[PDB]
Design an enzyme around this catalytic site. Sequence first.
Site, mmCIF file in Angstrom:
data_model
loop_
_atom_site.group_PDB
_atom_site.id
_atom_site.type_symbol
_atom_site.label_atom_id
_atom_site.label_comp_id
_atom_site.label_asym_id
_atom_site.label_seq_id
_atom_site.Cartn_x
_atom_site.Cartn_y
_atom_site.Cartn_z
ATOM 1 N N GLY A 1 2.543 7.092 8.646
ATOM 2 C CA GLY A 1 3.983 7.232 8.433
ATOM 3 C C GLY A 1 4.798 6.036 8.915
ATOM 4 C CB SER B 1 2.416 2.152 6.603
ATOM 5 O OG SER B 1 1.129 2.359 7.173
ATOM 6 C CG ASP C 1 -0.298 -3.536 3.101
ATOM 7 O OD1 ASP C 1 0.268 -3.218 2.037
ATOM 8 O OD2 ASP C 1 -0.619 -2.699 3.968
ATOM 9 C CG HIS D 1 -0.511 0.509 2.447
ATOM 10 N ND1 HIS D 1 -0.223 -0.328 3.504
ATOM 11 C CD2 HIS D 1 -0.226 1.760 2.874
ATOM 12 C CE1 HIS D 1 0.223 0.384 4.521
ATOM 13 N NE2 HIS D 1 0.225 1.654 4.165
#
Lengths: 15, 247
Positions: B196, B198, B97, B46
């Site tokens: 931020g 992630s 993800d 993502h």
Amino acid sequence: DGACSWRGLENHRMC
Amino acid sequence: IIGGEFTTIENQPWFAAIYRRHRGGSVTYVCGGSLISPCWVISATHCFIDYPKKEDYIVYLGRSRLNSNTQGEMKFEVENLILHKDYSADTLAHHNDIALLKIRSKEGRCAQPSRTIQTIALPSMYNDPQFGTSCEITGFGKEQSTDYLYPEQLKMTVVKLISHRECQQPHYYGSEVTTKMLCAADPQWKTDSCQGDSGGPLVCSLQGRMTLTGIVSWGRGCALKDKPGVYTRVSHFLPWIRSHTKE
């Protein structure tokens, strides 16, 4: 809040 | 990172800082990542899905500060940007993800291990610590949900693993969390990963060994009651990691 402030939406066109 | 403490790279020497250069020359921070081998950084799809072009990205290892150099840091171009084919991010939950960035310096080199740059071990398959285990998360992400700025200094905190049973509850995430995801939170909801963070590491001690248990993926707000951080369950993606790290 607002999805563009969440983990998941970093570096996204609509943000 | 909401709450927690400030830290430096030698306390997460595998942490990767990922930036994108914009058409116009300006560089902005994207996401964190984890060095799992000298040439491979692991992160979240993502972070890249909307801008999948490898030329846009710059990776740093051994960096403790967001917008200034850290002595001994290494800067990398992205030789290959591999996103997971089965990613889906309709609904709140991001599925599959997980992403890989092959790193290459201008001189054609991968990561050189040092005091501020080391790798992190992957877990053995389907082997995760029990719920209530304390794990750490690292990142340059927001310190408050309402913040406009990212911190200049790297941050770290501790959160506890939550069972799939607890996380699937309607008053938590319902059906949005799958068994290929891990929930983790503070008992008082006072500390968490945030925007931020992630792509960054969720690290647990698994048999007296530091393990990349998770990758920061998604969540509703940050450090909100009944809304844990959701992390990609790395031990469920080992075959995917194995094959793609030969690319």
